[PDB]
């Protein structure tokens, strides 16, 4: 899965020709874009996008989006398009490129072995910079529509206080259902195990069980200020009826989850090699008792 | 194959009016890096393993004395599976030949099939798992975090060198090893520190960095990644293209980065 990047904060974008500035973007399911919008106008990306406004979820049933990331679902339908309009207003540029100069950050010989050390420590932290800036990013609340950056970049304060940009995704369709548990009262399917379906679902908690390198997940009932338990699942569960660090069991994972709230699903990809057997479990929690399941998940030795 | 079956291979069924107690033995010579296989008992075969915490528990020969930990026995291993049939004991149990330096030396683990029979005594279809730890003659080009003094790596690190106060935690510790075709490389890190990529000798971090570049350009053979030990192994394939360069990160909040880096020199 390939992961794709609009970043309007780039010069190549910031001093352009036209009036109307246009990334374009064709991805796939389960891949995941990132869209860094100096003040975002219209909808607010990617939790509400540009028709030409509807909400992520029910354009791209399945997908979830933490801070300015969509990680797209991991099962589309039909191929579908949206747009994402960012208004650059003439110092909002100028306050950028005053940033991004002081940020300053193919065919190489380094023969030395020092200026090897140079090319690799400036890889390095570009790396450990990049890490910094999507941990600030998920701290951001859902609805958010001007883009700030971490401090401990040493930005001067003196700096924080025309075009046109759209950026434009298509992203194709597959035929693979996930192997999931949706909560919420409907008849599209989506998951191996909703409960409009019967059966899939009993006494309130949903069983699967997961391979080495498999995605699994769950998605509750929609409400917009729901919660799960714990609530940093999938990175804490209940593990033994205890609240355990998902890395002591499993380390090597990922997880695709919304921090503030129940609102989008939440995604574990388990990793290529699990040395037990595990029982896990995290619960979607509601003021609606009709709202509050389990899912239980039953993680599987082998290698992959 | 690699596997000591002991329920569908090796059978240690008793045959009608036993009195007496026979041991098959199941000897294997893994290569550095090969995966070994022990299948014992089912949940319709009453096979207890001995010692039950195999091979992380291992014997250091075939008369069930001297049991010793196989972390400190034999280190270096990796890759620790146990899978159950039955419950309440586990039944396939499974780990990853680690580089040695030091001569050939056995481990034994034992499956005892055990029946009382009418005085009165028991009798035991016992079968011994013989695994040989190969000799390697030169170390992993490799970087070990956890000691100066490694007994698998060419390159180590103390620990008053992989923390921060002799240094501040912003000067990262670069382990370069060079390498070329047919060669073992690995890192050990210490046992809460995180590799990145999950991944690293299958997606490794391209040197403009961030990328991981899923090593289309080198295919690596025998990829070892062990993030509940922290190691890692892989040999570099039978012909070198070009030249490359690539590198993992062992991170810790609040530490410095640990970072090992290869330069794979074109190789036939
Ligand atoms: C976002 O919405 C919440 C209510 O759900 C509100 O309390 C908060 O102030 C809003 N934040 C912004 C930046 O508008
Ligand atoms: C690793 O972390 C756990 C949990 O905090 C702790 O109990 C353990 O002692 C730590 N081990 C080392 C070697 O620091």
Known sequence: SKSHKCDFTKEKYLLSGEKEVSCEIDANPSDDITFICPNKIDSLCFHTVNISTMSIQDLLYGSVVYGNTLFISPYVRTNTPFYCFCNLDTVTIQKFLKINRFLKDLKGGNVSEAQADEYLNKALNRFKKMKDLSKFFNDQADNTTKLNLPKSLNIPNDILNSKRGIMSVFVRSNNNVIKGCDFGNNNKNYFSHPISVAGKVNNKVCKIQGKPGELVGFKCAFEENGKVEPPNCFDQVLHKNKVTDLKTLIPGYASYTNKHSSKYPYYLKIPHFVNEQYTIQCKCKSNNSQNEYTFELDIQPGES | ?268
């Open chain 2, 1 to 268: 194959n690699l596997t000591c079956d002991f329920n569908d291979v090796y059978k240690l069924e008793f045959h009608p009016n036993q009195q007496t107690s026979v041991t098959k033995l199941c000897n294997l010579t893994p290569n550095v890096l090969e995966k070994v296989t022990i299948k014992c008992g089912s949940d319709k075969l009453n096979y207890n393993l001995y010692p039950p915490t195999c091979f992380e528990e291992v014997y250091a020969s075939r008369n069930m004395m001297h049991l010793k930990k196989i972390k400190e026995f034999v280190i270096g291993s990796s890759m620790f599976m146990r899978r159950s049939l039955t419950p309440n004991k586990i039944n396939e149990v499974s780990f990853r030949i680690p580089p040695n330096m030091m001569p050939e030396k056995p481990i034994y683990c034992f499956c005892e099939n055990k029946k009382t029979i009418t005085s009165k005594k028991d009798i035991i279809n016992r079968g011994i798992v013989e695994i040989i730890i190969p000799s390697l003659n030169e170390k992993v080009k490799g970087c070990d975090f956890t000691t100066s003094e490694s007994t698998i790596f060419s390159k180590g690190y103390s620990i008053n060198e992989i923390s921060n106060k002799s240094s501040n935690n912003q000067q990262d510790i670069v382990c370069t090893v060079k390498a070329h075709a047919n060669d073992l490389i690995g890192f050990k890190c210490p046992s809460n520190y995180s590799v990145e990529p999950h991944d690293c000798f299958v997606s490794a971090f391209n040197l403009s960095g961030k990328n991981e570049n899923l090593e289309n350009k080198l295919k690596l053979t025998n990829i070892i990644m062990d993030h509940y030990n922290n190691t890692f192994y892989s040999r570099l394939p039978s012909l070198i293209s070009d030249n490359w360069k690539f590198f993992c990160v062992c991170s810790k909040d609040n530490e410095k980065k640990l970072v090992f880096t290869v330069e794979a020199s074109i190789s036939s």
